[PDB]
Amino acid sequence: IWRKWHVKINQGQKRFATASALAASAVAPLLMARGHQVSTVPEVPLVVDSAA
Amino acid sequence: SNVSADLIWEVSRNYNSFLVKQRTGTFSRDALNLTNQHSRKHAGFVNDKALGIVPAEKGVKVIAKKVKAANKPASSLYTVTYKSTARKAYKAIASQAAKHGYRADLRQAAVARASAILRSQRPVKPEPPKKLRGAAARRAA
Amino acid sequence: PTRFSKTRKHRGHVSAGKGRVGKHRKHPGGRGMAGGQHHHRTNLDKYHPGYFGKVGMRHFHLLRNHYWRPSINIDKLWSLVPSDVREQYLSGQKKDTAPVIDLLSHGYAKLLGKGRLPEIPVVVRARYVSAEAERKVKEAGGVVELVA
Amino acid sequence: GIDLRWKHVRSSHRKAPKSDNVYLKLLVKLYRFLARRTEAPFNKVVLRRLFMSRINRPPVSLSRIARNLKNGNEKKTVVVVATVTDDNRLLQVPKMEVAALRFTAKARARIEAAGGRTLTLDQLALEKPTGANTLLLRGPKNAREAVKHFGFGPHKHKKPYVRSKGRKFERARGRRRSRGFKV
Amino acid sequence: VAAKKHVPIVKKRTKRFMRHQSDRFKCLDSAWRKPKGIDNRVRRRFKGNLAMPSIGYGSNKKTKHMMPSGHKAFLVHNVKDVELLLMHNRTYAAEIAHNVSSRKRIDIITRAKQLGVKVTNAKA
RNA sequence: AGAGACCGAUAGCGCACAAGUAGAGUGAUCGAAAGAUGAAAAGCACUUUGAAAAGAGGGUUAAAUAGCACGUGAAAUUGUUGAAAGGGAAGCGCUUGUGACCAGACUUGCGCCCGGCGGAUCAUCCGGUGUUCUCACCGGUGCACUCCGCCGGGCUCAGGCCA
RNA sequence: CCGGGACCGAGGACCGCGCUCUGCAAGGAUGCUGGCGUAAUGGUCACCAGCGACCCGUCUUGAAACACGGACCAAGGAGUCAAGGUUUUGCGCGAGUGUUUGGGUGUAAAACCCGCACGCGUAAUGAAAGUGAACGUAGGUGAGAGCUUCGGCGCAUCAUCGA
RNA sequence: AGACUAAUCGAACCAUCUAGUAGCUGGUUACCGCCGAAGUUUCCCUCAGGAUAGCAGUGUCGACCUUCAGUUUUAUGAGGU
RNA sequence: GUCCCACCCAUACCCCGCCCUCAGGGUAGAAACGAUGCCCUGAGGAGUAGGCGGCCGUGGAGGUCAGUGACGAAGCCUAGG
Ligand SMILES: [K+]
Ligand SMILES: [K+]
Ligand SMILES: [K+]
Ligand SMILES: [K+]
Ligand SMILES: [K+]
Ligand SMILES: [K+]
Ligand SMILES: [K+]
Ligand SMILES: [K+]
Ligand SMILES: [K+]
Ligand SMILES: [K+]
Ligand SMILES: [K+]
Ligand SMILES: [K+]
Ligand SMILES: [K+]
Ligand SMILES: [K+]
Ligand SMILES: [K+]
Ligand SMILES: [K+]
Ligand SMILES: [K+]
Ligand SMILES: [K+]
Ligand SMILES: [K+]
Ligand SMILES: [K+]
Ligand SMILES: [Mg+2]
Ligand SMILES: [Mg+2]
Ligand SMILES: [Mg+2]
Ligand SMILES: [Mg+2]
Ligand SMILES: [Mg+2]
Ligand SMILES: [Mg+2]
Ligand SMILES: [Mg+2]
Ligand SMILES: [Mg+2]
Ligand SMILES: [Mg+2]
Ligand SMILES: [Mg+2]
Ligand SMILES: [Mg+2]
Ligand SMILES: [Mg+2]
Ligand SMILES: [Mg+2]
Ligand SMILES: [Mg+2]
Ligand SMILES: [Mg+2]
Ligand SMILES: [Mg+2]
Ligand SMILES: [Mg+2]
Ligand SMILES: [Mg+2]
Ligand SMILES: [Mg+2]
Ligand SMILES: [Mg+2]
Ligand SMILES: [Mg+2]
Ligand SMILES: [Mg+2]
Ligand SMILES: [Mg+2]
Ligand SMILES: [Mg+2]
Ligand SMILES: [Mg+2]
Ligand SMILES: [Mg+2]
Ligand SMILES: [Mg+2]
Ligand SMILES: [Mg+2]
Ligand SMILES: [Mg+2]
Ligand SMILES: [Mg+2]
Ligand SMILES: [Mg+2]
Ligand SMILES: [Mg+2]
Ligand SMILES: [Mg+2]
Ligand SMILES: [Mg+2]
Ligand SMILES: [Mg+2]
Ligand SMILES: [Mg+2]
Ligand SMILES: [Mg+2]
Ligand SMILES: [Mg+2]
Ligand SMILES: [Mg+2]
């Protein structure tokens, strides 16, 4: 039971990777290459008014 | 900026959800891909200008992307249906590719794909019956 | 990961890369540092010269807090001033005041002197100071004083 | 038979980067094209240094740049295929323009505050596609803690692998003549 | 339809490289294994014994993977899979997976006839 | 009490079962093997041969190629039927022959001319809408030497195997 | 300078070197003709025939050995994990670097946030008391990629004399 | 008689320390591609074992450095078979 | 014993085809390319102990094929491809 189950990651490299993922979420060709169906969404990034 | 057609091909060159890989070749089930091959030249979803052809009820249906609406996918395609005559469809498709400098390298492929779709809408002729060579003596009894 | 290992590549080959004549037995040569003076002397003398013997005198119950005195050179004395104020002095806009630097509050005890000092007077407080370091501060127009 | 000493000899130098950075691949495509379609020896050197590993691309500081901006190099463009770091010892930064693989945050801020400008290696290819009026700089290769241990032996004055420093750690027999011999 | 023109196909060998001594012991399968014993007569290339595979038996790059008609096989599981061969009907042929039901098998064969695509396992 | 990038009946605790059981030893102590019919017993009524165990018919079931020696049912080893070889081992590599069995390929395709049949509306121009701003689509006009499809006849070209 | 035989036909618009120059044997085969369109060519298996062929694993200078293990089949069966070192590859930041001992918070063993100390590095040398890194544009000489106003400037690194 | 002490005696039987240690014998599980050895030097209660140098592979970097060589020629030394 | 013609066959030598390994070139005002691709040219291929590279299979985990299936999944047999 004393094998290594958890991994330590530098916090700077964590923050780099999450920012790189947010940028890729605003590229419509990448959304389709990950299997999403977005042929009828008006704009990307998609923003809705505070009606929720 | 940080994103272009060359960058997008770099992150999708090795795997994407359109890929179909096995022995004897690699294919792509992409809508904006003519010849359904995996390559930078034919990867329609990557490039800024691309062409795609699907069969219609009577003729063919052709889509192309508008470069000014790359971030508005609902209104980013220009769609035309050709259902009058074969030669008329060939001409309009060829002009749509190699007249204003919009992917003149896809001129030969676009015409040939429209030809294959219209060829498959004709009636299918019946096949001749199968003959026998070694089971013939077996069934002669 | 187990799939990146030469163990996987040895499957099917006798001896697992260890030899047919020598066989990877249990402990040929002893365990640990055995044989240092007898049959491992050739290793212990090429590397690690000075391994055997005694040198110096002993010190019972040594307390490391008695010997705490970190040092900083004059080369980096100006880096202890905040950056915005530092640029005003260097560009020559103060010309009427001098900075007073507390080495202990930054965690240093002795001031050594290695590099050069710009000709702007400064006041330094320290517990210890080198002979060269005091010469260069005074020549720039400053003064060092002792504080304990 | 053919009686040859060597056969199927492979090349000793890298032919591509070992990294998987997507933008470094775009940079390598650019300079592959330039090196083939230009006669400038400058372009071929930059291509090779983009293949190299981090211990073969040591950093370069602002002080080392200022040393080479003397004796008639005040208006050339400095090119460094490496990281450029800051130096606390240097109190006044001269004005210059530098093209580098990357800059640290303080190095970039001090260059621009003195009236200079920083470039990227792709901006450099657009402005100087032949490397005219440039100077190439490298950092110190051997200034690494591991190189001090290389080639240890008798009468070599290298650094030994020890776990601590003090009088009780490898200082008695073979290090002084009062205990046997010395080295 | 007929395949695109190609150079004639040569094989260089048709036998199968069976394992040494697998014709005498039933615990040894026939698949090839490389002998590694210190005395083995097959490893030392004695005259009159089994041969060992080498890269020198490889096939011409122009005719590799093509069946004697001239096509290359492609495995399909439904109707949309066979429509990927719309632009390749003189170079590829379709092969239906073993676990496809009899009703879906009828739909695939009908569609492939409209496209002019050859099917290898057709009769059923 | 809640869980898992754990094991899946020679694994996981010695134990998924009337397991610290049956059994061994004077004794301290040692210590196994063994899960699965079917949704439902609907677990085969009656007739006939046999001293009986059982067999042959006939029934139940989606299925008895599920009958309590019960899901699926591999190999070693054995019986019957069919094919073949054998003058002190057999097996194997290269290469012909004979006998048995068998996968492909081919069945036509494009084009030109002549005749018949049917349908439109081919080129041009006007209005509207898109778009890569010059290229298209829809509505109107067109209305027989234009355009499209089918059938019949003739001609050239290309097409399978061995020489 | 004339005869007679054998094996082979890679390549796929043009481009070149040439010649006996309406053209050609000059940077790689075309033209004409017959039979057959299926088990005829071809493939798999079994058997007879010619030539060839000692039982594998292992220790050993030397194994087919009168050297050891192996009657047969199925399932199991052997370089792993932790701490501490080291060289090399990839990545982040860079004179600094390291959130996760702990606190805040949560859709609750995840993910997200915080910063006082501390570790390694930024300075060595002596047994120790102790002392502690610029004469010079951070030196001179010989090589040295690259740049250059063509006079020169000279990275990394190597050899050498000094501070 | 080194005899007997439950088929066990030149020191009984049972559980645990215990997976006791072995420079010694046995075994060590798919394929293809490229390169390719040693039984020699010095030290060791060393002689069936190690460390150390050599022989081998892999990763590179400096210039693509007029750079080298199990060789011949010319001039010039040493040797006691 | 000596001399002279013709002839026989190695995985050696010469010419041709194909595989791989190594080396050297071409390819963007892109009618453009699994640029990790394609085109052109030359040489080489034995191997125990051992080193490195690339690939094939098995039990589980995240993502994706809007994958197959009682109109038959998995497993098993088969001198049929
Ligand atoms: K090894
Ligand atoms: K000290
Ligand atoms: K002494
Ligand atoms: K067998
Ligand atoms: K080989
Ligand atoms: K048990
Ligand atoms: K009892
Ligand atoms: K049923
Ligand atoms: K029944
Ligand atoms: K059953
Ligand atoms: K050739
Ligand atoms: K042995
Ligand atoms: K034996
Ligand atoms: K590392
Ligand atoms: K710190
Ligand atoms: K130079
Ligand atoms: K007893
Ligand atoms: K021994
Ligand atoms: K003599
Ligand atoms: K796996
Ligand atoms: Mg080996
Ligand atoms: Mg062994
Ligand atoms: Mg050893
Ligand atoms: Mg050879
Ligand atoms: Mg084969
Ligand atoms: Mg041998
Ligand atoms: Mg043997
Ligand atoms: Mg549990
Ligand atoms: Mg059992
Ligand atoms: Mg059990
Ligand atoms: Mg059972
Ligand atoms: Mg009955
Ligand atoms: Mg059933
Ligand atoms: Mg039974
Ligand atoms: Mg059963
Ligand atoms: Mg059997
Ligand atoms: Mg026989
Ligand atoms: Mg109209
Ligand atoms: Mg040819
Ligand atoms: Mg004929
Ligand atoms: Mg035959
Ligand atoms: Mg023989
Ligand atoms: Mg004998
Ligand atoms: Mg023995
Ligand atoms: Mg025996
Ligand atoms: Mg099992
Ligand atoms: Mg007794
Ligand atoms: Mg053990
Ligand atoms: Mg034991
Ligand atoms: Mg070799
Ligand atoms: Mg001794
Ligand atoms: Mg031995
Ligand atoms: Mg050099
Ligand atoms: Mg070189
Ligand atoms: Mg003598
Ligand atoms: Mg080899
Ligand atoms: Mg498991
Ligand atoms: Mg099935
Ligand atoms: Mg069988």
mmCIF file of N, CA and C (backbone and C1' of nucleotides) in Angstrom, chain B residues 51 64 66 78 80-83 85 87-88 91-92 95-96 99-100 102 119 122 125 128 133-134 138, chain F residues 101-110 112 122-123 130-138 147-148 150:
data_model
loop_
_atom_site.group_PDB
_atom_site.id
_atom_site.type_symbol
_atom_site.label_atom_id
_atom_site.label_comp_id
_atom_site.label_asym_id
_atom_site.label_seq_id
_atom_site.Cartn_x
_atom_site.Cartn_y
_atom_site.Cartn_z
ATOM 1 N N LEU B 51 -14.424 23.229 -49.701
ATOM 2 C CA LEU B 51 -15.589 22.864 -50.494
ATOM 3 C C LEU B 51 -16.087 21.482 -50.093
ATOM 4 N N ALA B 64 -19.753 25.894 -49.192
ATOM 5 C CA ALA B 64 -18.458 26.538 -49.053
ATOM 6 C C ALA B 64 -18.533 27.493 -47.874
ATOM 7 N N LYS B 66 -17.648 30.915 -45.608
ATOM 8 C CA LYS B 66 -17.465 32.350 -45.752
ATOM 9 C C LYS B 66 -16.427 32.817 -44.741
ATOM 10 N N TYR B 78 -22.152 28.759 -47.306
ATOM 11 C CA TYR B 78 -22.869 29.231 -48.481
ATOM 12 C C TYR B 78 -23.296 28.016 -49.297
ATOM 13 N N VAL B 80 -25.650 25.898 -52.213
ATOM 14 C CA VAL B 80 -26.270 25.943 -53.534
ATOM 15 C C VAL B 80 -26.666 24.528 -53.934
ATOM 16 N N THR B 81 -27.803 24.399 -54.617
ATOM 17 C CA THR B 81 -28.285 23.123 -55.131
ATOM 18 C C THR B 81 -28.373 23.185 -56.650
ATOM 19 N N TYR B 82 -27.787 22.200 -57.325
ATOM 20 C CA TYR B 82 -27.817 22.104 -58.780
ATOM 21 C C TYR B 82 -28.614 20.873 -59.181
ATOM 22 N N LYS B 83 -29.734 21.078 -59.876
ATOM 23 C CA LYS B 83 -30.574 19.949 -60.250
ATOM 24 C C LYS B 83 -31.162 20.092 -61.649
ATOM 25 N N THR B 85 -29.005 20.014 -65.069
ATOM 26 C CA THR B 85 -28.313 19.229 -66.079
ATOM 27 C C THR B 85 -26.905 18.944 -65.584
ATOM 28 N N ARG B 87 -23.940 18.812 -67.299
ATOM 29 C CA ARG B 87 -22.914 19.722 -67.799
ATOM 30 C C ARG B 87 -23.046 21.106 -67.180
ATOM 31 N N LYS B 88 -24.274 21.536 -66.894
ATOM 32 C CA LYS B 88 -24.467 22.818 -66.230
ATOM 33 C C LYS B 88 -23.888 22.801 -64.823
ATOM 34 N N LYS B 91 -19.996 23.072 -64.838
ATOM 35 C CA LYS B 91 -19.471 24.401 -65.121
ATOM 36 C C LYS B 91 -19.559 25.311 -63.904
ATOM 37 N N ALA B 92 -20.705 25.320 -63.225
ATOM 38 C CA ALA B 92 -20.872 26.192 -62.069
ATOM 39 C C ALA B 92 -19.937 25.800 -60.934
ATOM 40 N N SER B 95 -16.288 26.933 -61.921
ATOM 41 C CA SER B 95 -16.144 28.372 -61.737
ATOM 42 C C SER B 95 -16.082 28.735 -60.263
ATOM 43 N N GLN B 96 -16.852 28.035 -59.434
ATOM 44 C CA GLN B 96 -16.874 28.308 -58.005
ATOM 45 C C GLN B 96 -15.527 28.058 -57.346
ATOM 46 N N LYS B 99 -12.079 30.593 -60.357
ATOM 47 C CA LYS B 99 -12.337 31.844 -61.062
ATOM 48 C C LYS B 99 -11.909 33.071 -60.279
ATOM 49 N N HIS B 100 -12.144 33.095 -58.971
ATOM 50 C CA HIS B 100 -11.748 34.214 -58.130
ATOM 51 C C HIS B 100 -10.629 33.838 -57.168
ATOM 52 N N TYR B 102 -10.268 30.918 -55.245
ATOM 53 C CA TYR B 102 -10.783 30.268 -54.043
ATOM 54 C C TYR B 102 -10.505 28.774 -54.187
ATOM 55 N N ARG B 119 -23.665 9.741 -61.100
ATOM 56 C CA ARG B 119 -23.600 8.415 -61.700
ATOM 57 C C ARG B 119 -24.333 7.381 -60.857
ATOM 58 N N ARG B 122 -28.512 6.740 -61.194
ATOM 59 C CA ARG B 122 -29.134 6.053 -62.309
ATOM 60 C C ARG B 122 -29.689 4.704 -61.866
ATOM 61 N N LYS B 125 -28.620 -1.906 -63.404
ATOM 62 C CA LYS B 125 -28.979 -2.980 -64.312
ATOM 63 C C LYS B 125 -28.881 -4.338 -63.619
ATOM 64 N N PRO B 128 -26.049 -10.958 -64.334
ATOM 65 C CA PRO B 128 -26.243 -12.278 -64.926
ATOM 66 C C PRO B 128 -26.249 -13.354 -63.860
ATOM 67 N N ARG B 133 -19.020 -24.866 -61.819
ATOM 68 C CA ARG B 133 -17.952 -25.601 -62.489
ATOM 69 C C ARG B 133 -17.647 -26.952 -61.860
ATOM 70 N N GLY B 134 -17.690 -27.060 -60.534
ATOM 71 C CA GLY B 134 -17.379 -28.315 -59.874
ATOM 72 C C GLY B 134 -18.551 -28.872 -59.093
ATOM 73 N N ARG B 138 -22.458 -32.171 -59.191
ATOM 74 C CA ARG B 138 -23.216 -32.487 -57.986
ATOM 75 C C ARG B 138 -24.697 -32.181 -58.169
ATOM 76 P P C F 101 -13.991 -34.131 -56.214
ATOM 77 O "O5'" C F 101 -13.542 -32.776 -55.510
ATOM 78 C "C5'" C F 101 -14.019 -32.445 -54.217
ATOM 79 C "C4'" C F 101 -13.254 -31.301 -53.598
ATOM 80 C "C3'" C F 101 -13.508 -29.915 -54.162
ATOM 81 O "O3'" C F 101 -14.723 -29.340 -53.724
ATOM 82 C "C1'" C F 101 -11.196 -30.217 -53.826
ATOM 83 P P C F 102 -15.446 -28.209 -54.607
ATOM 84 O "O5'" C F 102 -14.445 -26.970 -54.570
ATOM 85 C "C5'" C F 102 -14.315 -26.170 -53.406
ATOM 86 C "C4'" C F 102 -13.206 -25.156 -53.540
ATOM 87 C "C3'" C F 102 -13.458 -23.989 -54.474
ATOM 88 O "O3'" C F 102 -14.272 -22.993 -53.883
ATOM 89 C "C1'" C F 102 -11.256 -24.815 -54.778
ATOM 90 P P A F 103 -14.927 -21.837 -54.779
ATOM 91 O "O5'" A F 103 -13.888 -20.637 -54.679
ATOM 92 C "C5'" A F 103 -13.619 -20.009 -53.434
ATOM 93 C "C4'" A F 103 -12.519 -18.986 -53.552
ATOM 94 C "C3'" A F 103 -12.779 -17.835 -54.508
ATOM 95 O "O3'" A F 103 -13.569 -16.813 -53.927
ATOM 96 C "C1'" A F 103 -10.623 -18.711 -54.900
ATOM 97 P P G F 104 -14.456 -15.848 -54.852
ATOM 98 O "O5'" G F 104 -13.524 -15.564 -56.109
ATOM 99 C "C5'" G F 104 -13.375 -14.259 -56.638
ATOM 100 C "C4'" G F 104 -11.990 -14.042 -57.193
ATOM 101 C "C3'" G F 104 -11.915 -13.296 -58.510
ATOM 102 O "O3'" G F 104 -12.022 -11.895 -58.337
ATOM 103 C "C1'" G F 104 -10.487 -15.185 -58.576
ATOM 104 P P A F 105 -13.104 -11.042 -59.160
ATOM 105 O "O5'" A F 105 -12.576 -11.116 -60.652
ATOM 106 C "C5'" A F 105 -11.266 -10.690 -60.975
ATOM 107 C "C4'" A F 105 -10.969 -10.937 -62.425
ATOM 108 C "C3'" A F 105 -12.174 -10.883 -63.346
ATOM 109 O "O3'" A F 105 -12.686 -9.569 -63.575
ATOM 110 C "C1'" A F 105 -11.010 -12.849 -63.788
ATOM 111 P P C F 106 -12.541 -8.761 -64.953
ATOM 112 O "O5'" C F 106 -13.336 -9.615 -66.034
ATOM 113 C "C5'" C F 106 -12.851 -9.718 -67.362
ATOM 114 C "C4'" C F 106 -13.659 -10.693 -68.175
ATOM 115 C "C3'" C F 106 -15.135 -10.372 -68.320
ATOM 116 O "O3'" C F 106 -15.371 -9.445 -69.365
ATOM 117 C "C1'" C F 106 -14.851 -12.663 -67.776
ATOM 118 P P U F 107 -16.568 -8.383 -69.275
ATOM 119 O "O5'" U F 107 -17.869 -9.240 -69.592
ATOM 120 C "C5'" U F 107 -17.960 -10.043 -70.763
ATOM 121 C "C4'" U F 107 -19.275 -10.778 -70.824
ATOM 122 C "C3'" U F 107 -20.505 -9.892 -70.641
ATOM 123 O "O3'" U F 107 -21.565 -10.313 -71.493
ATOM 124 C "C1'" U F 107 -20.469 -11.568 -68.963
ATOM 125 P P U F 108 -22.531 -9.202 -72.132
ATOM 126 O "O5'" U F 108 -22.491 -8.018 -71.067
ATOM 127 C "C5'" U F 108 -22.452 -6.657 -71.473
ATOM 128 C "C4'" U F 108 -21.299 -5.926 -70.831
ATOM 129 C "C3'" U F 108 -21.216 -4.431 -71.099
ATOM 130 O "O3'" U F 108 -22.047 -3.678 -70.234
ATOM 131 C "C1'" U F 108 -19.094 -5.416 -71.439
ATOM 132 P P G F 109 -22.552 -2.214 -70.660
ATOM 133 O "O5'" G F 109 -21.226 -1.333 -70.692
ATOM 134 C "C5'" G F 109 -20.690 -0.776 -69.501
ATOM 135 C "C4'" G F 109 -19.576 0.196 -69.800
ATOM 136 C "C3'" G F 109 -19.943 1.372 -70.689
ATOM 137 O "O3'" G F 109 -20.555 2.421 -69.961
ATOM 138 C "C1'" G F 109 -17.904 0.412 -71.425
ATOM 139 P P C F 110 -21.531 3.464 -70.692
ATOM 140 O "O5'" C F 110 -20.543 4.430 -71.484
ATOM 141 C "C5'" C F 110 -19.845 5.463 -70.807
ATOM 142 C "C4'" C F 110 -18.715 6.006 -71.642
ATOM 143 C "C3'" C F 110 -19.102 6.768 -72.897
ATOM 144 O "O3'" C F 110 -19.518 8.098 -72.639
ATOM 145 C "C1'" C F 110 -17.359 5.263 -73.399
ATOM 146 P P C F 112 -20.701 11.691 -78.765
ATOM 147 O "O5'" C F 112 -20.577 11.217 -80.279
ATOM 148 C "C5'" C F 112 -19.555 11.731 -81.116
ATOM 149 C "C4'" C F 112 -19.537 11.046 -82.459
ATOM 150 C "C3'" C F 112 -20.850 11.024 -83.219
ATOM 151 O "O3'" C F 112 -21.141 12.247 -83.868
ATOM 152 C "C1'" C F 112 -19.868 8.882 -83.293
ATOM 153 P P C F 122 -33.971 25.412 -69.942
ATOM 154 O "O5'" C F 122 -32.751 25.394 -70.961
ATOM 155 C "C5'" C F 122 -32.038 24.196 -71.228
ATOM 156 C "C4'" C F 122 -31.270 24.298 -72.519
ATOM 157 C "C3'" C F 122 -30.732 25.681 -72.856
ATOM 158 O "O3'" C F 122 -29.500 25.961 -72.212
ATOM 159 C "C1'" C F 122 -31.834 24.783 -74.742
ATOM 160 P P A F 123 -29.281 27.347 -71.434
ATOM 161 O "O5'" A F 123 -28.982 28.401 -72.587
ATOM 162 C "C5'" A F 123 -27.801 28.314 -73.370
ATOM 163 C "C4'" A F 123 -27.882 29.206 -74.582
ATOM 164 C "C3'" A F 123 -28.134 30.681 -74.311
ATOM 165 O "O3'" A F 123 -26.964 31.396 -73.952
ATOM 166 C "C1'" A F 123 -29.619 29.942 -75.974
ATOM 167 P P G F 130 -30.427 38.509 -49.557
ATOM 168 O "O5'" G F 130 -29.677 37.106 -49.543
ATOM 169 C "C5'" G F 130 -28.263 37.040 -49.507
ATOM 170 C "C4'" G F 130 -27.746 35.798 -50.184
ATOM 171 C "C3'" G F 130 -26.237 35.696 -50.295
ATOM 172 O "O3'" G F 130 -25.646 35.211 -49.106
ATOM 173 C "C1'" G F 130 -27.231 35.148 -52.371
ATOM 174 P P U F 131 -24.485 36.040 -48.375
ATOM 175 O "O5'" U F 131 -23.200 35.757 -49.265
ATOM 176 C "C5'" U F 131 -22.789 34.430 -49.544
ATOM 177 C "C4'" U F 131 -21.970 34.360 -50.805
ATOM 178 C "C3'" U F 131 -20.783 35.303 -50.881
ATOM 179 O "O3'" U F 131 -19.650 34.806 -50.190
ATOM 180 C "C1'" U F 131 -22.002 35.397 -52.903
ATOM 181 P P U F 132 -18.479 35.794 -49.720
ATOM 182 O "O5'" U F 132 -17.492 35.836 -50.967
ATOM 183 C "C5'" U F 132 -16.211 36.443 -50.861
ATOM 184 C "C4'" U F 132 -15.389 36.259 -52.112
ATOM 185 C "C3'" U F 132 -16.036 36.746 -53.407
ATOM 186 O "O3'" U F 132 -15.018 37.237 -54.278
ATOM 187 C "C1'" U F 132 -15.520 34.463 -53.603
ATOM 188 P P C F 133 -14.711 38.808 -54.375
ATOM 189 O "O5'" C F 133 -15.882 39.374 -55.292
ATOM 190 C "C5'" C F 133 -15.899 39.116 -56.691
ATOM 191 C "C4'" C F 133 -16.666 40.171 -57.448
ATOM 192 C "C3'" C F 133 -16.090 41.584 -57.377
ATOM 193 O "O3'" C F 133 -16.325 42.248 -58.617
ATOM 194 C "C1'" C F 133 -18.291 41.590 -56.536
ATOM 195 P P U F 134 -15.157 42.346 -59.712
ATOM 196 O "O5'" U F 134 -15.086 40.887 -60.336
ATOM 197 C "C5'" U F 134 -15.858 40.544 -61.478
ATOM 198 C "C4'" U F 134 -16.260 39.094 -61.448
ATOM 199 C "C3'" U F 134 -17.028 38.599 -62.665
ATOM 200 O "O3'" U F 134 -16.715 37.222 -62.848
ATOM 201 C "C1'" U F 134 -18.370 38.348 -60.747
ATOM 202 P P C F 135 -17.149 36.451 -64.184
ATOM 203 O "O5'" C F 135 -18.283 35.449 -63.683
ATOM 204 C "C5'" C F 135 -17.971 34.093 -63.422
ATOM 205 C "C4'" C F 135 -18.692 33.541 -62.216
ATOM 206 C "C3'" C F 135 -20.035 32.885 -62.455
ATOM 207 O "O3'" C F 135 -19.915 31.606 -63.047
ATOM 208 C "C1'" C F 135 -20.087 34.156 -60.453
ATOM 209 P P A F 136 -21.184 30.908 -63.735
ATOM 210 O "O5'" A F 136 -21.969 30.262 -62.512
ATOM 211 C "C5'" A F 136 -23.385 30.258 -62.476
ATOM 212 C "C4'" A F 136 -23.894 30.167 -61.063
ATOM 213 C "C3'" A F 136 -25.392 29.993 -60.907
ATOM 214 O "O3'" A F 136 -25.796 28.649 -61.091
ATOM 215 C "C1'" A F 136 -24.620 31.649 -59.404
ATOM 216 P P C F 137 -27.129 28.292 -61.908
ATOM 217 O "O5'" C F 137 -28.283 28.367 -60.816
ATOM 218 C "C5'" C F 137 -28.279 27.508 -59.687
ATOM 219 C "C4'" C F 137 -29.170 28.034 -58.592
ATOM 220 C "C3'" C F 137 -30.619 28.273 -58.976
ATOM 221 O "O3'" C F 137 -31.395 27.088 -58.950
ATOM 222 C "C1'" C F 137 -29.799 30.145 -57.791
ATOM 223 P P C F 138 -32.603 26.885 -59.984
ATOM 224 O "O5'" C F 138 -33.735 27.870 -59.455
ATOM 225 C "C5'" C F 138 -34.484 27.550 -58.293
ATOM 226 C "C4'" C F 138 -35.416 28.669 -57.893
ATOM 227 C "C3'" C F 138 -36.452 29.093 -58.923
ATOM 228 O "O3'" C F 138 -37.580 28.236 -58.960
ATOM 229 C "C1'" C F 138 -35.424 31.010 -58.010
ATOM 230 P P C F 147 -28.577 21.010 -78.577
ATOM 231 O "O5'" C F 147 -29.354 20.821 -77.200
ATOM 232 C "C5'" C F 147 -29.010 21.593 -76.059
ATOM 233 C "C4'" C F 147 -29.824 21.208 -74.848
ATOM 234 C "C3'" C F 147 -29.835 19.735 -74.477
ATOM 235 O "O3'" C F 147 -28.675 19.330 -73.775
ATOM 236 C "C1'" C F 147 -32.031 20.592 -74.376
ATOM 237 P P C F 148 -28.210 17.794 -73.806
ATOM 238 O "O5'" C F 148 -29.346 17.023 -72.996
ATOM 239 C "C5'" C F 148 -29.408 17.094 -71.580
ATOM 240 C "C4'" C F 148 -30.607 16.361 -71.025
ATOM 241 C "C3'" C F 148 -30.684 14.868 -71.294
ATOM 242 O "O3'" C F 148 -29.839 14.099 -70.458
ATOM 243 C "C1'" C F 148 -32.796 15.845 -71.673
ATOM 244 P P C F 150 -30.933 6.857 -70.828
ATOM 245 O "O5'" C F 150 -32.160 6.099 -71.505
ATOM 246 C "C5'" C F 150 -33.096 5.372 -70.721
ATOM 247 C "C4'" C F 150 -34.214 4.811 -71.565
ATOM 248 C "C3'" C F 150 -33.797 3.892 -72.700
ATOM 249 O "O3'" C F 150 -33.540 2.571 -72.260
ATOM 250 C "C1'" C F 150 -35.409 5.447 -73.478
#
